[PDB]
């Protein structure tokens, strides 16, 4: 996260860390949606251009963290995966359209003051909060500058941008399964996600029922916090039926 600040303890209890077993490294961000399912970006697991294709056996999920490198004994929980499900129409060949994946944990995790799931939006919440000008929050342990890694979880609040502005800031073909966010060069406010933050959550707090909903997943950007560029996020609500389907077809 570029121009974000350190998170407070327990600020994003749904934040997950995809960790590689060997070499031991931070792979991506992710989110806890129930006691057995984690949501992340499909490019974090499968990206043929860079010969990236991870499997169950190659990853670990660390939940309840704050510090990026320390094993927070008695605070974090580490789980193994039972299954990984990538959206069948994930388009890695062109624009990372439908950049979403679900991971089923080997065993359910127990909640705590540091571990709690986030809510997935319903048509009405999506409709009222996903409007240009409304701010959302992104969290992650990713880089601090384009080219600078934090010790703790960072947070930045960003505005959703109008779709034409998003389409006119890039040469990539944007689809309805994406939305972009960030400040305009003109707003003298900065902030953005960056390498290492992929897969993490873009969340909003409902003023109707005070709950936090995950509206997007960090998907892609061109550099980090560049002026005139914005970050793109998977549109969770547009892919919710796929989510529901794998969950009640394969578990809960």
């Amino acid at each position: 996260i570029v121009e974000g600040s350190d998170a407070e303890i327990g600020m994003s209890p749904w934040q997950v860390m995809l960790f590689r077993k060997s070499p031991q490294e931070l792979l991506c961000g992710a989110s806890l949606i129930s006691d057995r399912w984690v949501l992340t970006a499909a490019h974090c697991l499968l990206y043929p251009p860079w010969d990236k294709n991870f499997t169950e056996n190659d990853l670990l999920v660390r939940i309840g963290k704050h510090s990026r490198t320390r094993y927070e004994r008695n605070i974090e929980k580490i789980s193994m995966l039972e299954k990984i499900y990538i959206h069948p129409r994930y388009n890695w060949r062109e624009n990372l359209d439908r950049d979403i994946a679900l991971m089923k944990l080997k065993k359910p995790v127990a909640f705590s003051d540091y571990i709690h799931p986030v809510c997935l939006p319903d048509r009405e919440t999506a409709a009222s909060l996903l409007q240009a000008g409304y701010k959302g929050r992104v969290t992650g342990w990713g880089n601090l500058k384009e080219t600078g890694q934090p010790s703790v979880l960072q947070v930045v609040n960003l505005p959703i941008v109008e779709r034409p502005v998003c389409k006119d800031s890039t040469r990539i073909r944007i689809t309805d399964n994406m939305f972009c966010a960030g400040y305009k060069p003109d707003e003298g406010k900065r902030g953005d996600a960056c390498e290492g933050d992929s897969g993490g959550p873009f969340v909003m707090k409902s003023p109707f029922n005070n709950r936090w909903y995950q509206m997007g997943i960090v998907s892609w950007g061109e550099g980090c916090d560049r002026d005139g560029k914005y970050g793109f996020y998977t549109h969770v609500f547009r892919l919710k039926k796929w989510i529901q389907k794998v969950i009640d077809q394969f578990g809960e």
């Binding site: 031991q24 490294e25 670990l60 490198t69 320390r70 094993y71």
Partner: peptide, 10 residues
């Protein structure tokens, strides 16, 4: 940079 994690998770 990452601190070692306990062996029963590998």
């Amino acid at each position: 940079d990452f601190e070692e994690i306990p062996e029963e998770y590998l």
